[PDB]
Structure formats: structure tokens, C-alpha cells
Design an enzyme around this catalytic site. Structure first.
Site, short mmCIF file in Angstrom:
data_model
loop_
_atom_site.label_atom_id
_atom_site.label_comp_id
_atom_site.label_asym_id
_atom_site.label_seq_id
_atom_site.Cartn_x
_atom_site.Cartn_y
_atom_site.Cartn_z
N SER A 61 -31.36 1.41 65.33
CA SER A 61 -31.92 2.56 66.02
C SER A 61 -31.46 2.71 67.46
O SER A 61 -31.67 3.77 68.05
CB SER A 61 -33.45 2.51 66.02
OG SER A 61 -33.94 3.08 64.83
N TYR A 147 -42.14 8.74 64.40
CA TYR A 147 -40.76 8.26 64.47
C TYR A 147 -40.07 8.44 63.13
O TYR A 147 -40.60 8.02 62.09
CB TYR A 147 -40.79 6.79 64.86
CG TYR A 147 -39.45 6.17 65.18
CD1 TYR A 147 -38.86 6.36 66.42
CD2 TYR A 147 -38.81 5.35 64.26
CE1 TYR A 147 -37.66 5.76 66.74
CE2 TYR A 147 -37.59 4.75 64.56
CZ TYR A 147 -37.03 4.96 65.81
OH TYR A 147 -35.85 4.37 66.15
N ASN A 149 -36.09 8.94 61.05
CA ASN A 149 -34.66 9.16 60.93
C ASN A 149 -34.33 10.56 60.41
O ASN A 149 -33.28 11.11 60.75
CB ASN A 149 -34.01 8.16 59.99
CG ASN A 149 -34.01 6.77 60.52
OD1 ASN A 149 -34.09 6.55 61.73
ND2 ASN A 149 -33.91 5.80 59.62
O1 H7G Z 1 -29.93 -2.17 56.70
C1 H7G Z 1 -29.96 -1.08 56.06
O2 H7G Z 1 -29.21 -0.95 55.06
C2 H7G Z 1 -30.88 0.10 56.45
C3 H7G Z 1 -31.88 -0.16 57.58
C4 H7G Z 1 -32.89 -1.09 57.43
C5 H7G Z 1 -33.79 -1.33 58.47
C6 H7G Z 1 -33.68 -0.60 59.65
C7 H7G Z 1 -32.67 0.34 59.80
N1 H7G Z 1 -32.53 1.09 61.04
S1 H7G Z 1 -33.59 2.41 61.31
O3 H7G Z 1 -33.72 3.16 60.07
O4 H7G Z 1 -33.02 3.34 62.28
C8 H7G Z 1 -35.16 1.78 61.97
C9 H7G Z 1 -36.37 2.06 61.35
C10 H7G Z 1 -37.55 1.57 61.88
C11 H7G Z 1 -37.54 0.79 63.03
C12 H7G Z 1 -36.33 0.51 63.65
CL1 H7G Z 1 -36.27 -0.48 65.13
C13 H7G Z 1 -35.14 1.00 63.12
O5 H7G Z 1 -33.91 0.70 63.74
C14 H7G Z 1 -31.78 0.57 58.76
#
Ligand code: H7G
EC number: 3.5.2.6
Length: 358
Positions: A61, A147, A149
Site C-alpha cells: 500500500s 480504506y 483498493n
Molecule cells: O500479496 C498479495 O498477493 C496481495 C496482497 C496481500 C496483502 C496486502 C496487499 N496490499 S493491499 O491490498 O494494498 C493492503 C490491504 C490492507 C492493508 C494494507 Cl497495509 C495493504 O497494503 C496485497
């Protein structure tokens, strides 16, 4: 580095790495403008590759701060306005719930309950259209923050549509290249794969999975050196020569909404400096950061306040990152790890280091 920097960094990070069982870690402190780098452990446990200043980590993020600045740059260029309706850039978004949802709402998670994750079922842009058409808001626009995506990811995709460029190409040409972030990538090229750390989840080596709007919401990979340069660029935007990028950085640090003591920027989040550490440390826990909260509009938004703690946590399945800086003190920190460990441990460590140096 000044021994005081070394002392505080080592005394803080060594126990963190031990307590959290972090395989590899890179830290940058920016102190009176100059960067100081520290590395520990392994980028690849199996192949015994150490973390170096050239190791790429998944930012998760923290990628949203690049998306927010890139959107800010598009505003400064006059290509978009945050006051524009979403339907101005996606006319097929005809469902009535989209009336009154602007690019500002998308960028700041205040459109009315767009979900944290885009569903895995969504692949094509026609799947995406269907998803947003069928989505039912829980709240009116500009009343609650959740929050998401699916919110800031759509903002990033729409913000680059007038440019005609792909999101990756706009990011490269308008943000990465002017700032000389030459080891920062949405898609890691084959030539750089030798530097791409593995993430570790339950002991398994993992990399981020492809998904819809991944580039916009959690797509960036970077080195500790490029990330220190990113922090310096955001600490002192007026040193940046490209005028719309300078203004775009400032727009991303404007305060658009308030909930509790936190202010929402574009990607960046801010608190008044000096902060109560318990407020940012507990506040970073996902139990608070990911929850639905009423927001108060800042009418009109406050331009970037130098007396702020500006920060962003980030995670992927296998990585955990944190960036924070205080423009008034010319002070900043980047923490990149190839394990996703609890957010409050990150912020506590960062607070201890920066408080000791201010
Ligand atoms: O690994 C993967 O395949 C996908 C994956 C898994 C876990 C987090 C993310 N990043 S996220 O969706 O943007 C996000 C969501 C909630 C809090 C935070 Cl801090 C955050 O970064 C992406």
C-alpha cells in the site's frame, strides 16, 4: 553515519527483527537532508542472498503514495479535477449510485463503502465495469471513510485516461524518471530479477499475485535507495524542477478529510506534529486503519502543513513496509521488510528512531 543515528537505529531494529522473525530488512533515515542506509538479513533465504541497498522490496500500500502523487500531477497539468464526477472519465458508469461520486471521493476512500479488495472474479475491464455498476453504497458520498483498493485503484486508472498513457507508462514518465527512481518498478524487468527479494509468509517464499487494479493500489517494488529519494522528494517538493510534479506532490499532502486526529491526503495520511505516539501506533493497527469511520470534510482542503507527521504503511502477502517523515524537521524514515509483520510494531520502531533524532 553519525553515531547517534547508528545507535538509535541498531538499538531499535535489532530487537524488532528478532521479535518479529523478519528474514531481511532495509532501513533509510533521512537526517538534515542526507540519507543513511542500514541492511540486515536475507533477501532470499534459500539462495543465501543478503539484503543490500539494491534489493527490491514489494511496497504494497505504500504504492498508493505514488498513485496519489501521479493523480496530483494530472490535476496540476489540468488533465483532471478532483471535483469532476467519476462518470466524466467512465461514461459507461451509468448506474444511479454514481451520481455525486467525484474523483476526490475515489482518491480518499469516501465514495460510500467501496470494498477493500476487488473480487478475484474480476479480470477484464468489462468485469470491472460490471463490478462497479452493481456495487451498492452503504453511505452517501463524503460521509464515511473505508480504506479500499477498489476506491483509490479506480482513481489511479481514471486519472491517467486523458493522458492516453497506460498507468505504468504515466507513472514511469511523469513520476519515476523525473525523480531518478531508476530502480523502482510496477513490473520487475528480467534484468532486475536478481535483486528482487522473496517475501515470506508462514515460511514460504512468495511474490505478489496479479489482480485487477494491482498497479494502482499495491503494484510498486523499490530499493531502499529509491525510497529514500522518494521521501526526500516529498520532504522538499520545491526542489523538484518539473513544475506539475512539484504541485502534484503538494496536492497529495493536502488535508481533505479528518477522522480522529488523522487527516487523509492523496495516498499519504497525516497527523499534526508533534504527535501522540499512542495515537499513530495504535491507529496503524488494521483494526482501526481498515474500519469504517465518519469523516469531517476540510472545506476547503488545507495545503500541505510542514508541521505534520506524514506516513503510510504497506503490506503484501510476504512484505511489510512503512514510510514516515516530518517536513518541519527535515526528518524521515523508510522501513522495508520481506515479512508482513504487525503495523504497530513498525510505527513504534519508526517513532522511537525519529523522536530520538528530532
Ligand atoms: O500479496 C498479495 O498477493 C496481495 C496482497 C496481500 C496483502 C496486502 C496487499 N496490499 S493491499 O491490498 O494494498 C493492503 C490491504 C490492507 C492493508 C494494507 Cl497495509 C495493504 O497494503 C496485497
Amino acid at each position: 553515519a553519525p553515531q547517534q543515528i547508528n545507535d538509535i537505529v541498531h538499538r531499535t531494529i535489532t530487537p524488532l527483527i528478532e521479535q518479529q522473525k523478519i528474514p531481511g530488512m532495509a532501513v533509510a533515515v533521512i537526517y538534515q537532508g542526507k540519507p543513511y542506509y542500514f541492511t540486515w538479513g536475507y533477501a532470499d533465504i534459500a539462495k543465501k542472498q543478503p539484503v543490500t541497498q539494491q534489493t527490491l522490496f514489494e511496497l504494497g500500500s505504500v504504492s498508493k503514495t505514488f498513485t496519489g502523487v501521479l493523480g496530483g500531477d494530472a490535476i496540476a497539468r489540468g488533465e483532471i479535477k478532483l471535483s469532476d464526477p467519476t462518470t466524466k472519465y467512465w461514461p459507461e458508469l451509468t448506474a444511479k449510485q454514481w451520481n455525486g461520486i467525484t474523483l476526490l471521493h475515489l482518491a480518499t476512500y469516501t465514495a460510500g463503502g467501496l470494498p477493500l479488495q476487488v473480487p478475484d472474479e474480476v479480470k477484464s475491464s468489462s468485469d470491472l465495469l460490471r463490478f462497479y455498476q452493481n456495487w451498492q453504497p452503504a453511505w452517501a458520498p463524503g460521509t464515511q471513510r473505508l480504506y479500499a483498493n477498489s476506491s483509490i485503484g479506480l482513481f489511479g486508472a481514471l486519472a491517467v485516461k486523458p493522458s492516453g498513457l497506460s498507468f505504468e507508462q504515466a507513472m514511469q514518465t511523469r513520476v519515476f524518471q523525473p525523480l531518478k527512481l531508476n530502480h523502482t518498478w510496477i513490473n520487475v524487468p528480467p534484468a532486475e530479477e536478481k535483486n528482487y527479494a522473496w517475501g515470506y509468509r508462514e515460511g514460504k517464499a512468495v511474490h505478489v499475485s496479479p489482480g485487477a487494479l494491482d498497479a494502482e493500489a499495491y503494484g510498486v517494488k523499490s530499493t531502499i535507495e529509491d525510497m529514500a529519494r522518494w521521501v526526500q522528494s516529498n520532504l522538499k517538493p520545491l526542489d523538484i524542477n518539473e513544475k506539475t510534479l512539484q504541485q502534484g506532490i503538494q496536492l497529495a499532502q493536502s488535508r481533505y478529510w479528518q477522522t480522529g486526529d488523522m487527516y487523509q491526503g492523496l495516498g499519504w495520511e497525516m497527523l499534526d506534529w508533534p504527535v501522540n505516539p499512542d495515537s499513530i501506533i495504535n491507529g496503524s493497527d488494521n483494526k482501526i486503519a481498515l474500519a469504517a469511520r465518519p469523516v469531517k470534510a476540510i472545506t476547503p482542503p488545507t495545503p500541505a502543513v510542514r508541521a505534520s507527521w506524514v506516513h503510510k504503511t504497506g503490506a503484501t502477502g510476504g512484505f511489510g513496509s512503512y514510510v514516515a517523515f516530518i517536513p518541519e524537521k527535515e526528518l524521515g524514515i523508510v522501513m522495508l521488510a520481506n515479512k508482513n509483520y504487525p503495523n504497530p510494531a513498525r510505527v513504534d520502531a519508526a517513532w522511537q528512531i525519529l523522536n530520538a533524532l528530532q
